[PDB]
């Protein structure tokens, strides 16, 4: 099933960091759409929960340098 999750990315403080994060998520098999927002240090990920999960997403971001969690 199609899911939409918002991730908080507190380390997304450098001007190209949105793209760093976007790339890292978008590479995850089963993701459909990633939009990132510098101002609110967040990424909104639409994905298939039969193919991947929030934990695999937050692992991808941490791997790239920017650990994340579900937005509060």
Spell 43-71 as b/e; 16+ CB within 10 A means b.
bebebeeeebbbeebbebbeebebebeee
**CATH code for position 42:** 3.30.70.100
Q: Output the CA–CA distances (angstroms, integers) from residue 35 to 2, 10, 18, 47, in the order listed.
A: 16, 16, 9, 12
- Alpha carbon 16 to its chain centroid, in Å, reads 15
Resolution as reported, in Å: 2.0
Total domains in the chain come to: 1
Q: Which approach determined this entry?
A: X-ray
Find out whether 28 and 58 touch, Cβ atoms under 8 Å: no
Residue found by looking up tokens 């999960």 in the block: 53
Query: Domain range holding 17?
Result: 1-72
């Amino acid at each position: 099933a199609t899911q939409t999750v918002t991730l908080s990315v507190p380390g997304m403080t450098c001007s190209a960091c949105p793209i760093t994060v976007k790339k890292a998520i978008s590479k995850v098999e089963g993701v459909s759409k990633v939009d990132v927002t510098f101002e609110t240090r967040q990424a909104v990920v639409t994905f298939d929960d039969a193919k991947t999960s929030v934990q695999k997403l937050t692992k991808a971001t941490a791997d790239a340098g920017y650990p994340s969690s579900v937005k509060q």
